[PDB]
Every structure is written in C-alpha cells, then in structure tokens.
Curated annotation (Swiss-Prot), chains A, B:
Keywords: ATP-binding, Ligase, Nucleotide-binding. Belongs to the glutamate--cysteine ligase type 2 family. YbdK subfamily. It catalyses: L-cysteine + L-glutamate + ATP = gamma-L-glutamyl-L-cysteine + ADP + phosphate + H(+). GO terms for molecular function: ATP binding; glutamate-cysteine ligase activity; ligase activity, forming carbon-nitrogen bonds. The keyword GTP-binding does not apply. It comes from the Bacteria. The keyword Repeat does not apply. It comes from Salmonella typhimurium (strain LT2 / SGSC1412 / ATCC 700720). This is Putative glutamate--cysteine ligase 2. HAMAP family: Glu_cys_ligase_2 (MF_01609). Homodimer. Pfam families: GCS2. The gene is ybdK. One of its GO terms (biological process) is modified amino acid biosynthetic process.
Amino acid sequence: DFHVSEPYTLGIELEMQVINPPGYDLSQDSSTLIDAVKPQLTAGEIKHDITESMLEMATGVCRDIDQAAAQLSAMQHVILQAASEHHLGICGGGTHPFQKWRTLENFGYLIQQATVFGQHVHVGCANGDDAIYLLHGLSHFVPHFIALSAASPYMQGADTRFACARLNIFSAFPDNGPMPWVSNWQEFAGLFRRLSYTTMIDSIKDLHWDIRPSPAFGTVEVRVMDTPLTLDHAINMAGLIQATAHWLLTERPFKPQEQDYLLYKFNRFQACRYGLEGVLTDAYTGDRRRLADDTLRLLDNVTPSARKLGADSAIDALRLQVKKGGNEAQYMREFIADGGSLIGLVQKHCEIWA
Amino acid sequence: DFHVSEPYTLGIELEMQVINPPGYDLSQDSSTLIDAVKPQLTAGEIKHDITESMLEMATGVCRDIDQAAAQLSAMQHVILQAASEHHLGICGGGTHPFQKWRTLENFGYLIQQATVFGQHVHVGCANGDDAIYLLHGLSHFVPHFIALSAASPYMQGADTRFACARLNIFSAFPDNGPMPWVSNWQEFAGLFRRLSYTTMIDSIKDLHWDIRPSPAFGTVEVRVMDTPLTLDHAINMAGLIQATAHWLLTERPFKPQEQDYLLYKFNRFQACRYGLEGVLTDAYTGDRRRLADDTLRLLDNVTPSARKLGADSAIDALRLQVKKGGNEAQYMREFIADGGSLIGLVQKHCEIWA
Ligand SMILES: [Mg+2]
Ligand SMILES: [Mg+2]
C-alpha cells in the first residue's frame, strides 16, 4: 500500500493563528484571508481548517531544509501581505493564550475547548517496512521533540504550569498517544483493517497518533510539536527529525521491541509538564537521564547525518537552545514576569513572525 | 503478596457529594460532618478526601449483596441524621451539574478541575492468577458497566452531550485507562517494578486503571462507574459485578490475549458518549452489536451465577433498566427538558437519596 519516496525527503505543515489587531483575540474569518491569498501563491499550499481562526501552510515535497525554508518564506511573504490589507495578524504558538470557547455530535464539549495549533513534519521512506522501523525509532525522542518545541504554557486566561498544554486537550480521544504496537508493514495493514471496523475510523487521517505513517505520501509524520513562534525554529525541528531519521535507518542503532513503549506516556508527560527539565525513565533498567542531557546525546549522535543532508545549521541552533536557555514557552513566561499582559504577549508574537 | 480471599467476597466504595442547602453548590466543610459520624458505626468506614466536598463510604468485606445493602443502609441512616442537624445535604452523581473552582506542582490545572465522584467495587480471589484472569474478563464489560451506571451529563452548567463525562477528566494522566497487558501474576509484579522506576509512582494506589488488582485486600477492583443517585442502583451494580466474576472464573468463557484489548478505548468511549446506545465492535470479526443488546446477553449469561450468590434481584432490576429505557444521566436530561433547573436537579437528587 506504500507509495515509494526518495528517502529522507522532507515536508512541513504549520498551523497558524489568525489574530484581530484591536483586542488580539482569535479571528472569526480566515476564509477571506485564505481566498485573497491563493491567487497570489507561487510555492506551497494554503488550506482551510474548521474553526475559522487557523491558517495551515504546507510545503511540497522538499529535498532539504533550505528548499523547505524558502518555500515557507514564499508563503509567508504572500500571507503577511494580504493580512495587512484585511487588518489581521498572524502568529504561532501551540495555544492562543486567552481566547475562550457534525464532529460536534461525535465528541461534544471535547472539541469546544482551546483551538489548537501544531507543526507536522513528514520524512520520506523507501518501502514501508522502513517506515515502521523509523516510527519506533522516532518514538524514543518524542519527549525530546516536545520539549525542544513547547510553546503553549497559557490556556483560557491562566498559567497551566505546563510547557506544552496543547497536547492535553486531545487525551480523552480513544486514538490519542502512541500507535499500538506492530513490527512491520504487513501487521500495520492488519491493525488499520481492524481499527477501521469501528464507526469512528474510515481512513488513515482519522487516527491522531503522535507519529503515523502515510501510505499515500510515502512518509512518516511526527505530529507532537506545537506551532512555534518563528519560521527558523520550525525549520530547525524539521532538520532534527530529518537527521534523526537518517541516523536511525542508516546506522540502525536500535532493535525495537514492544516493551520499549512501556513508559512512553510517563516520559511524554514529563516533557509536557516540565520541559528539558523533565526526567526520562528507561523501561528496562530504571536509569533516569535529564531530558536536556539526553537531547545533547541525540544531537551529537545525528551530527554526521545532518552534515550529509545539509541540516547542520539546524542542529547547531538546537544545541545553543539547550546548553544555555530553553523552549519558547519558558520565554513567554519571562515576558509575563516583566509586568507584561497577555494582550501584549500575542501582539509581540505577531511581530516576531517577521 | 496476594492475600488469600474467600472467592466472590464483595467490597463497595461510594464517593458521595456534600451539598450546601441554600444554593446547592458543593460544600467545602465536610470533615466536621465525618467526625460527627465515625463513632456511631457498627460496620464499615467513612473518610474525607483532599477537597472536603466528598464523603467516602465503604463497606467492609461482605459475602453477598444483602450484607452489603445492610451496612450501606446503616451508614446512611447515621449520615442523613448528622447532615440534617448540621445544615447540609447528600447526593450522588459522578459530577456536580454546575460547581466551578504540593500535588498541583505535578499536574497543575489538571487537578484544579471539577471534583468527581465514583463507585468502586472489589471482588475477592483465591490466588493472584485468578485476579489477572478475572481482570481480563471484566475488561470485556467495562463499556457495559459505564453505560449502566452513567450519571454525569452536566459539567460547569452545561450539557457535555456525554452520558458519562466524569471519566474524561482523568484522561491526561499517563496511567489512565486499561492496565497494560500481562498474562499472569508473575508478569504483573514485573510490570509494577518497572512502572515504579518513575517519580510519579511508588505504590498501587497511584495507578488509576479502570480495573486494578489489590494484593493487600486480595481483590480485583473495578473503578469506572459514576456514583449513582441511590443506594439500590449502587448495589445492583455490585451484584452484577460479583455475578460476572463468578461466571468468568467458574465457566472460563475467554482465553484472554493482548489483541483482545485493541478496540478497548473505542468501545469505552462509545459507552461514555452514548448510552446503552453506544455500539460495540469486535476486535477480530468487526461485528457491531448495540450496547443495550449486548448487556442483555451479559445479563442472561450470569443469571445462573447471580442466583447461586443471592444477587438475582440485581440482575432483575438491571434487565428492567435495559429493556425500558436507560441510565440516570438520561433521566437527568429529561428533568431539564421538562422545565427543571440545574439547582432543582441537585435538590431532587438529595431527596432521591432517602
Ligand atoms: Mg499533518
Ligand atoms: Mg477505590
């Protein structure tokens, strides 16, 4: 079932907040911005989501982060243009810091909390058995990815004490968290066949896993990241995932087993609550490594791969971020301790995107 | 180790709501009520929890639903008198229809939520391999237990659209849901040794699974039901659960396997969202049976077990419930569609408890 990709190919989706410049709440009509924009587009796709306070931008299939980065700018330039003209703003962030409130029948008040904004990264694979191996490998660094990209400390007017609270709002859905264990593509096809016997699942797109394979695009999509405040930070996470994927498939450093996932949810929570401060627990021995120490280990491990792919810039910047500093949620909170308001925080994010 | 128990013994825990009679919000001062009641007990305990809007009442080790009924009647006569003379009222339901509000370091805004009320039922086992087997059998019927006992359609003044919304507020904890697979008691001690390598867990009380073996008490505890509106419905559920444990251990319907749990979370969502109207899906054949229909199968199957244990009155009352309508949450909505107010709802609920 698996479309064949040039291995290590890259694709980025970004879910973008649309703002309203007086009071800076979430906009009501982004289908007027999106319809203004499409005409003037050269590279990429801009898509309509459901609540009309979101603007998805996506690259095409990219051969490295330079191509990705410049497709992102070609969309940004056009977006920021038509935004001025409709007196609107655009920013990232995993949540909007203060906005309050047929898929409605199925899920009720679960889809009536914060509307929520993520970055997805696609990586190309040769055959699909590789895709499953890669998925398992990338699942070991889901905490790392989350903590490098956390950008959602504020929900519904208040500090949640989480670096990433965005992911919490998906947790009562039956399909949340890690993909159930399969060992190869034959078994994955078996899993999807059985899951789809339910009323709730008709397609691959209906399964909101942390990491899921796309048969159609020939990829593995990692979906845990909050939409970041800036294009550089998005590109840096894309490079890390590309580079990590290359390390895994090339050097094959793991022999993945079902018992690896045992503490998946405990480690994933640690990265959401705290950040790079979160504590990782090994399933088998119980040895615990601080998240920050362990992402330095990861950035070291994937440096050779990043050089071959043209993504050394990205893991150079991430190493800076970890060694002295933190995620974009940490810095949102320093802004507030300087007597800033939440109305002014969102405004500074609209500007920072540029 | 697994304390040896007389097979099919019964424990009932009931978390009750303590109410403030003018405006019918939850009271904050329910431990002065408890301390008036403790001395006058001839059988069973009463406790406080972290907020003092809850009153835990637990039977001791009982031998049938008649012994359980008797102690719960005896505790209740004494609490109805201690609350009457003390300006407070008592009711059930898994959620308060409109209440708003050290460990808030660990979980933040997640425990700063609606405080929720549940009924737990322990069933005793001889060896601790029978517990693992019993747990896997009851897991098949979690959807049914929830659908039958659902009593939490309103949160924060609004209709969630769910039968049981109480179970959603736990979904963000990494340990929510089903216990990860083990095939026997030796494997279960391995599982627990590994889960406890984390900061977040030291004892068994810390793991908030739907069904959970208690080695100390020598039981399997099912933990998914909302506190019902009356003691009779509480007892009928205990009766069904004990009859079901007997049928399972005695006739061994199932050869349990990890792949049996594939659709577990999809099926329990259906029970939470819809009533007995939820549809249950078989992991192997993809067969869809409506939940009201499958609860009648479960009722017929455990009829011989229930008769033997003196709980045949409970499965007679539940067959009635399944045939002529549905759960307490449904009848909560009918009171509001009739012209009722949410304050009147809680007041009616204090009256039904007597
Ligand atoms: Mg995507
Ligand atoms: Mg309990």
